[PDB]
Amino acid sequence: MPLPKSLKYGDTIGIYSPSSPVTYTSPKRFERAKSYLLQKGFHILEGSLTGRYDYYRSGSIQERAKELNALIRNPNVSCIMSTIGGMNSNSLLPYIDYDAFQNNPKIMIGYADATALLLGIYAKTGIPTFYGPALVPSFGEFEPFVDDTYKYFLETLLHDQALPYNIKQPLFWSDEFINWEEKTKEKELRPNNWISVTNGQATGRVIGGNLNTIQGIWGSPYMPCIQEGDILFIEDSSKDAATIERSFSFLKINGVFDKVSGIILGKHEQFDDCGTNRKPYEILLEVLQNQRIPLLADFDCCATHPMITMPIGVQVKMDATNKTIHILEKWKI
Amino acid sequence: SNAMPLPKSLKYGDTIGIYSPSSPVTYTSPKRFERAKSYLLQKGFHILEGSLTGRYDYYRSGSIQERAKELNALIRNPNVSCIMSTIGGMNSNSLLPYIDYDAFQNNPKIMIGYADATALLLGIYAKTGIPTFYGPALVPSFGEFEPFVDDTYKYFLETLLHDQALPYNIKQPLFWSDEFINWEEKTKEKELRPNNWISVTNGQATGRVIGGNLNTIQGIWGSPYMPCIQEGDILFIEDSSKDAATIERSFSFLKINGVFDKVSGIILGKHEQFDDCGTNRKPYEILLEVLQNQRIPLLADFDCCATHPMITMPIGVQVKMDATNKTIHILEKWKI
User: Which residues contact A182 (CB under 8 A, 6 or more apart)?
Assistant: First the structure.
């Protein structure tokens, strides 16, 4: 695999808005997020659609692709980070300069709808991409949680890490639906646990991201093929039991559970259980119908805070029983 | 093409089996459910109520296995002529591994519904080759008050009961509505809005029609239950009660999958209660942005969707679409 250079203090992070126009609609949180990273020591290069507004999106298909491609082609930018998701990143896929990326690999990071681009870049170039912070949701978060998301970002992207790289559980989390633009109270600290839903271990290439979003790219050249022995990493956020049953069944009928060696399931921010009192993993277990696949749930790589930064497309070992995740293969220089 | 297995035409007095593959409407909307059944019974059909009728499991009628059992009992019943969903939802695709495709193949029936039931319409077609029908679901379609229910019923009989010489012309309804009123109880008359189809991009296409509810297709894409789209097919798609962001994603999903390189034309349903997100854009405008510089004949605002009234459309048979003149003809038999 070609690999991106590690992030360094003094580097420039390019930001782009491939879907929702958050830099227009949530300017306080946007400015707070920029200032946070500037203070840490990174410059921010604002993509061409920053401050622009086209209702549910930042701009036309072409204009969004141009915004991203300008960052891809800029040798001064070491990391390209989505501002936020939405629904419409998959529109850009035919128009991205994959060749320019492959020729000068950089860190591509974000989450949620940005999955479309993370996976498409990986599919087209073979360069690992990163399920991790987007500027506004992740680095616009108030203290305390922002600081733990930031710690995890440095660990994956900037620190010199020896292999194997151990991914550790945070002590506390939150999904509270408060404090978006302005802070009104402290978010409750939720004690954490990862869940040993189905015991066992697996080692394989990790593939996945936001499940809802995967259904917008599935079957295309931009969806990496799932191979025998891969580890599936999936999360959904702010959806409901009916939506995720459809998604889990989508994977089942596509044979994904006959291929993968294990499953890492993210927490589900603000899950709506439709009155059932069922957890997301229980719905998945129904869909799996007693097929014994190791399953570790409530992983902190999703819309809940704080967020881990996870490489995608590299070898991983998971132990659902003992609740560990290690990265086995280098993901950066 | 060669003659193929087909389901028997509907007859007066036939039994319609109803099942709930997703939302538990028979429990949550009991007045519309009772009105719909009464409407068909009053026409002289019998209704066989599947095993989950009146049951409730929150967002669904029952477990995955319970729902498969419900539908299979109808598939396996030689006295049922037509199997009709009560309503959609989100979760029909869960049943797909568990359906008795061999029993269906042994005794093909008219399979009809819409919206989430696309997963089963397309999965039965994919597995068996038997045409299925994008058309009425019991409670939304046949629980509609007069006058629109009568137009829906007329189209249902024209396609499933009456003998039709080929080419069979699909006539445009004269009036339509998507008003978000009169679900359980009637409060006023719906507006009889003058209807039209839309010539979005001129031209003609002839090919096998494939499609249904686009949102639902994304829950079965890539599986053995999704029929493969072939060069020259006509794509039929509709979405209902969604928004501009959602449909852009679905359109781009088709684009990146190469679908628009294959199909000869596109039929786009009306979009009930579309949320334009403030853009003032029509669904077809969003689609055409996705299409970019690729010219494809496109007929839009077709009445085979959640708006009233509803046309019954066979899937998996040859059709001629004329987007210039706003016509649709069915060219191959779909029933015997």
Answer: A28
| Contact state of A215 with B221 under an 8 Å Cβ cutoff | yes
Phi, psi angles (nearest 5°) of residue A22: -65, -30
Give this entry's resolution in angstroms: 1.4
- How many Cβ atoms are within 10 Å of A166's Cβ, its own excluded? 11
Which of A20, A301, A35, A333 minimizes the C-alpha distance to A168?
Answer: A301
Element (H, E) at B284: helix B283-291
Cβ contact (<8 Å) for B219 and A250?
Answer: yes
- Right CATH number for B1-167 from 3.40.50.1240, 3.60.15.10, 3.30.70.920, 3.40.50.10740? 3.40.50.10740
At residue B84, the 3 state secondary structure works out as strand
Q: Do B256 and A57 touch (CB under 8 A)?
A: no
Q: Taking the CB of residue B156, how many other CB atoms lie within 10 A of it?
A: 25
Burial of A300 (0-12, 13-18, 19+ CB in 10 A): buried
CA distance A170 to chain B (A): 33
Matching fold, domains B1-167 and B168-336: no
Q: Into which CATH architecture does domain A1-164 fall?
A: 3-Layer(aba) Sandwich (3.40)
Top-level class of domain A165-333:
alpha beta
CA angle A270, A276, A280 (to 5 degrees): 50
Cβ-Cβ contacts under 8 Å for A144 (sequence gap 6 or more): none
Residue B296 and residue B260 in contact, taking contact as beta carbons nearer than 8 Å: yes
Q: What does the alpha-carbon distance between residue B36 and residue B26 come to, in Å, rounded to a whole number?
A: 10
Beta bridge partners of B49: B18
**Which residues in chain A touch residue B246, judged by CB atoms under 8 angstroms apart?**
87
* A6/B contact by beta carbon, under 8 A: no
Among B93, B257, B277, select the one facing A219 at the smallest CB separation.
B257
The tokens describing B118, both together, are 């696309």
